[PDB]
Amino acid sequence: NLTEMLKGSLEGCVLEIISRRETYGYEITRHLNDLGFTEVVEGTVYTILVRLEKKKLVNIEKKPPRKFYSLNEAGRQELELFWKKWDFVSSKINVLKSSN
Amino acid sequence: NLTEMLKGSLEGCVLEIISRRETYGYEITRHLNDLGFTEVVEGTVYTILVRLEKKKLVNIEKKPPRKFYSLNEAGRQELELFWKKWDFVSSKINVLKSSN
């Protein structure tokens, strides 16, 4: 049960996945499952994709009815900020772990 | 602004701090600030300490009116689980980062 711990990082993982190429909810979910986040279900990814759309971080396209997501410039900018935040937070938590 | 990302890990960082020796809210807060989580304020630590008390993870002592916190056996058990969760979640997020 990693939900609470993973919650605050999950939007970024999704942005990272969408960055690699045009994709869609089902495939994002399976990619997160394949990574080892087996408890991540489609509805969790759906909700994230909605948040990313309202923040205007992704370009959308109805293709052959499915929405295809890729990153726009804001999205790439935002993904960069996420990883800088991740690197900082994780390094400091590991500095703390390092003493037990 | 690391609050959302740090939120799901902050209770564990506190448990880790209390584990090292008997301590109290102000000192825990300053320890987190000194680590680099400068936006962590006392009220955030207070709220966490309350959660840890209701989960019965800490022994409390009114000493010379301040409450002194140390870990009981449940608390040590729980801290161990937190770090196992942290190691898993962070390793998988870093596996993902490793491809950009």
- Tokens read off for A19: 């960055």
Q: Which of B37, B88, B90 sits opposite A90 (nearest CB)?
A: B90
What whole-number distance in Å separates Cα of residue A17 and Cα of residue A12? 9
Cβ–Cβ < 8 Å for B57, B70: no
Neighbours of A72 (CB within 10 A): 13
Residue of A2, A5, A87 for testing the chain B interface, max B β-carbons within 10 Å: A5
Residues B12, B51 contacting (CB under 8 angstroms): no
- For residues B82 and B34, the answer to whether their CB atoms sit within 8 Å is no
Domain A1-100 has CATH 1.10.10.10: yes
Q: Are B79 and B19 in contact (CB under 8 A)?
A: yes
Tell me the resolution in Å.
2.2
Distances (CA, A) of A16 to A23, A91, B20, B60, B98: 11, 19, 37, 44, 11
Helix (H, G, I), strand (E, B) or coil at A68: strand
Determination method here? Answer: X-ray
- Kindly list the domain boundaries of chain A, sorted by start residue: 1-100
Any B CB within 8 A of A55 CB = no
